[PDB]
Write a protein that binds this ligand. Structure first.
Ligand SMILES: CCCCCCCCCCCCCC[C@@H](O)CC(=O)N[C@@H](CO[C@H]1O[C@H](CO)[C@H](O)[C@H](O)[C@H]1O)[C@H](O)CCCCCCCCCCCC(C)C
Ligand SMILES: *[C@@H]1O[C@H](CO)[C@@H](O[C@@H]2O[C@H](CO)[C@@H](O[C@@H]3O[C@H](CO)[C@@H](O)[C@H](O)[C@@H]3O)[C@H](O)[C@H]2NC(C)=O)[C@H](O)[C@H]1NC(C)=O
Ligand SMILES: *[C@@H]1O[C@H](CO)[C@@H](O[C@@H]2O[C@H](CO)[C@@H](O)[C@H](O)[C@H]2NC(C)=O)[C@H](O)[C@H]1NC(C)=O
Ligand SMILES: *[C@@H]1O[C@H](CO)[C@@H](O[C@@H]2O[C@H](CO)[C@@H](O)[C@H](O)[C@H]2NC(C)=O)[C@H](O)[C@H]1NC(C)=O
Ligand SMILES: CCCCCCC
Lengths: 296, 204, 99, 241
């Protein structure tokens, strides 16, 4: 029920002259906006990406962000001229700002900055501040940024008021896609394990939405505790993929099943039995010469 | 040019009010500052405007800023003679040292005193040394009168300056003319200018 | 500062030989964000290859998803070739349907 | 109050020469800036610095080098002086905030050579009898003529003490040959006193012009006199007649 809204900025500076800034916006695991360096305007990746804001209210925010993009670029190049030669090109700056929606009329905002891959600065209260363990040569650039009372005032406004106000409406406009249910599809395969005389059983689960899922190898009522749950891998159509593997001794596969529990299945779990007729036919349809197989 | 100041030049009578304008296209525009530059001196800050629609005062100086029209106005009320200078409009593009200043070319302000009783006259002054050299002094004419330059290669004409004989609370305008030439008569030295009908031309 | 990319090659639907599908190449955990990703069929480059917008996780590590329409067969070899500053040579990762 | 000093207040150089303009600041300001002022333009940024050892190019850096040896000093170096560098140079300093504190300015004249450098000739013209009887005021005119470059200070000295009361000297000098780039100049001044003051034979009036030409530091060799930095004066005595 808790949704985190994230504005991610990626800025690359190769030398004094060359630079590019690309941004993406997320509401939970759904991309809502895109702003390529090449593009003059913020793009909607959803039909409800404008939220409850008006075309007038939206253009006011878009102009502010257009001015910011231009300014940020020149301001980074200047703060580099201040740190010279303690910091030099190429420079990578990342920025993550947003708010996460809590139950009731409650929400906390954040603005984190990472420099050359490492988290270094945040906006907290009314100022920019370095994080503990941040390098000493960042104190003077943070002092010059804190001198700019105008930027500080608008950042406070965006974090305290604008972000929650906008996201409350964004949840309204996008409710149909956030609570969208896509059913998973599971299939089986096996590879040799790293250990001699062992096999690794693979249960593939793809195309489910939302992300929470339960995948377990079973033997009747007994959950195999060797089940290794893989990471969530994304699909191109906003669904998820997950693998769950199980190391077994060659010949122990018969009796094993892969159970999948998901909200979209309405209590009707997917139970995939290893040596069943469905599996045999599925396995015969995905045979190959094994050329360039991994090292399993 | 991203900062344009109007007018380029402005002549005001002493005690009268002055209006100086600044239009700019600088983006972003954090603040606008007005400077006074006394001739041959440096810039002295009169005032700074920072808000979207701002107003500011500092004695006889007052200024407005409209960030939507990108326009500032400087007002000088009851202009004194010491207000003769160049007034420069500066736009700051950041609220810190990361910013750049964008400077207007300035407005040259000339404050001219009244001269309660003009007594225009052209006098010939001879050198203290036994040289037979001389100068022509056009003096005591009204502050409105403009002294035109020499339309002749061998004749030199200076512009008008007002001197204060403070002890007698008396101000007077004067312009000098001279020539290397033989046939140089003072009675016609300043004829390229608008000479008052009442001008005294003593005979040599 | 410099990190090597992790490459994951997997299909959208259950693989059935001779049946059209989508091949995904998920490239993750790299730094800097400049990367070249190309998808290959029998050692040759596939032309119509789509890429998601570059993004990053809560731990600041970058990721991007490359995908393309393919048709698995018993003989056609599919791979994802990644050229990044962190590697001396491009890393080619073959699609292994059983893995 | 925050302040900045510049040296020299005026400088004369020749084409191909080397000029150094210095800036001193004791406000403990990290940031320092160099501008040039030209007619028809606003101040233009040449170079700037974010601290000791740092020098960054501005908008018009071509033909200029900069050096920030310490916090307090910032210099502008012209290794190869060109006449297009003739301008007024302003130095400024600041902290992390947006205000810059400007120095008083340096005037730099870049010449083709020094052959054309001349000291002013000075004359005092005596009040006319017609002004005396008509106004009961007496105006003395001082003419400083034939000087190049424009590097002079004209002041009036009555009975041994310099006066500033009743004086108006021309703001700008006159070109003696307007249609000529290296033209010699003329400048006038007037001192207006009472008729009774001029008519006092004990009253001694002296116009003083101090020229800044050349020294032993400048190489000069011509058949005419060296235009050495000198004091030129003209003087008149008041008279009963
Ligand atoms: C939806 C898709 C959107 C893409 C997602 C983007 C991610 C979200 C970013 C949120 C920040 C935006 C709020 C700021 C604006 O709201 C004001 C503005 O434009 N400021 C600029 C102009 O400032 C000038 O213009 C301003 C006009 O408002 C004022 O006049 C101001 O006083 C003046 O100085 C300001 O310098 C730019 C400086 C940026 C400050 C951030 C620096 C990073 C901090 C880390 C330090 C770096 C360290 C590693 C070395
Ligand atoms: C936006 O929200 C933040 C909170 O997330 C507000 O920050 C708080 O701002 C006040 C001042 O405006 C800070 O109070 C100060 O506390 C110090 C002692 O720590 C005291 O010396 C000062 O006199 C003052 O009372 C407060 O600390 C700060 N909170 C945090 C977490 O730093 C911010 O003001 C809000 N801005 C707007 C414009 O709504
Ligand atoms: C600054 O960095 C950019 C990016 O690294 C340089 O541009 C690249 O130059 C190489 C030269 O072989 C090209 O192959 C790339 O395609 C260029 N990229 C782009 C987008 O232009 C640039 O040359 C560098 N500039 C300086 C002054 O060193
Ligand atoms: C990233 O975006 C900026 C802004 O669009 C690019 O810089 C501009 O490029 C155009 C065309 O080359 C110039 O006319 C502008 O003067 C540039 N500056 C600005 C601030 O607009 C920049 O080239 C882009 N970089 C890359 C690598 O695509
Ligand atoms: C997409 C704009 C949302 C406004 C909140 C900025 C942190």
């Amino acid at each position: 029920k808790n949704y985190t809204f994230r504005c991610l900025q990626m800025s690359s500076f190769a030398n004094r002259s060359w630079s590019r800034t690309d941004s993406v916006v997320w509401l939970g695991d759904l991309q809502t906006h895109r702003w390529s360096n090449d593009s003059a305007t913020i793009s909607f990746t959803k039909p409800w990406s404008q939220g409850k804001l008006s075309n007038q209210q939206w253009e006011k925010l878009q102009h502010m962000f257009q001015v910011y993009r231009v300014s940020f670029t020149r301001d980074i190049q200047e703060l580099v001229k201040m740190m010279s030669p303690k910091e030099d090109y190429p420079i990578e700056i990342q920025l993550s700002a947003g708010c996460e929606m809590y139950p009731g009329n409650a929400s906390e905002s954040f603005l984190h900055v990472a420099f050359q891959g490492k988290y270094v600065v945040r906006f907290w209260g009314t100022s920019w501040q370095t994080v503990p363990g941040a390098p000493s040569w960042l104190d003077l650039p943070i002092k010059v940024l804190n001198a700019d009372q105008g930027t500080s005032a608008t950042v406070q406004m965006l974090l305290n008021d604008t972000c929650p106000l906008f996201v409350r409406g964004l949840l309204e406009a996008g409710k149909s896609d956030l609570e969208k249910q896509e059913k998973p599809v599971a299939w089986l395969s096996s590879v040799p394990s790293s250990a001699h005389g062992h096999r690794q059983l693979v249960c593939h689960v793809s195309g489910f939405y939302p992300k929470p899922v339960w995948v377990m190898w079973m033997r009747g009522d007994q959950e195999q505790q060797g089940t290794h749950r893989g990471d969530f891998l994304p699909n191109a159509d906003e669904t998820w993929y997950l693998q769950a593997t199980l190391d077994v001794e060659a010949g122990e596969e018969a009796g094993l099943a892969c159970r999948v529990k998901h909200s979209s299945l309405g209590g009707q779990d997917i139970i995939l039995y290893w040596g069943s007729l469905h599996h045999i036919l599925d396995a015969q349809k995905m045979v190959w010469n094994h050329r360039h197989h991994h090292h399993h | 040019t991203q900062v344009e100041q109007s007018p380029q030049s402005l002549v005001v009578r002493q005690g009268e009010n002055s209006v100086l304008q600044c239009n700019y296209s600088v983006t972003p525009d954090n603040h606008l500052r007005w400077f006074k530059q006394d001739t041959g001196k440096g810039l002295v800050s009169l005032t700074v405007l920072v808000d979207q629609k701002d107003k500011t005062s500092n004695g006889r100086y007052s200024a407005t800023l409209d960030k939507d029209a990108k326009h500032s106005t400087l007002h000088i009320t009851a202009t004194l003679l010491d207000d003769t200078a160049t007034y420069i409009c500066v736009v700051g593009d950041r609220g810190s040292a990361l910013g750049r200043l964008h400077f207007g070319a300035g407005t040259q302000l000339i404050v001219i005193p009244d001269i309660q009783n003009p007594d225009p006259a052209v006098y010939q002054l001879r050198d203290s040394k036994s040289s037979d050299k001389s100068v022509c002094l056009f003096t005591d004419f009204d502050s409105q009168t403009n002294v035109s330059q020499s339309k002749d290669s061998d004749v030199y004409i200076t512009d008008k300056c007002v001197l204060d004989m403070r002890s007698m609370d008396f101000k007077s305008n004067s312009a000098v003319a001279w020539s290397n030439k033989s046939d140089f008569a003072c009675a016609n030295a300043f004829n390229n200018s608008i000479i008052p009908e009442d001008t005294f031309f003593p005979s040599p | 500062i410099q990190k090597t990319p992790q490459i994951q090659v997997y299909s959208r639907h259950p693989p059935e030989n001779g049946k059209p599908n989508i091949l995904n190449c998920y490239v993750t955990q790299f730094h800097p964000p400049h990367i070249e990703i190309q998808m290959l069929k029998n050692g040759k480059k596939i032309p119509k290859v789509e890429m998601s917008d570059m993004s990053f996780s809560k731990d600041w590590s970058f990721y991007i998803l490359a995908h393309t329409e393919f048709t698995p067969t018993e003989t056609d070899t599919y791979a994802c070739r990644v050229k990044h500053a962190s590697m001396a040579e491009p890393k080619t990762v073959y699609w292994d349907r059983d893995m | 109050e925050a302040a900045v000093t510049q040296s020299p207040r005026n400088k004369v150089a020749v084409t191909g020469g080397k000029v150094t303009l210095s800036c001193n600041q004791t406000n403990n300001h990290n940031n320092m800036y160099w501008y040039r002022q030209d007619t028809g333009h606003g101040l233009r940024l040449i170079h700037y610095s974010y601290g000791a050892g740092s020098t960054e190019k501005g908008d018009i850096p071509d033909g200029y080098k900069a050096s920030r040896p310490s916090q307090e000093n910032f210099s502008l170096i012209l290794e190869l002086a060109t006449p297009s560098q003739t301008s007024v140079y302003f130095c400024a300093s600041g902290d992390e905030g947006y205000t810059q504190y400007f120095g008083p300015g340096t005037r730099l004249l870049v010449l083709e050579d020094l052959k054309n450098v001349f000291p002013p000739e000075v004359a005092v013209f005596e009040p006319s009898e017609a002004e005396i009887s008509h106004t009961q005021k007496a105006t003395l005119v001082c003419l400083a003529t034939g000087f190049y470059p424009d590097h002079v200070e004209l002041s009036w000295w009555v009975n041994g003490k310099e006066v500033h009361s009743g004086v108006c000297t021309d703001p700008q000098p006159l070109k003696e040959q307007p249609a000529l780039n290296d033209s010699r100049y003329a400048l006038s001044s007037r001192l207006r006193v009472s008729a009774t003051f001029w008519q006092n034979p004990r009253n001694h009036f002296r116009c003083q012009v101090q020229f800044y030409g050349l020294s032993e530091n400048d190489e000069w060799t011509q058949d005419r006199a060296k235009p050495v930095t000198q004091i030129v004066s003209a003087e008149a005595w008041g008279r009963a007649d």
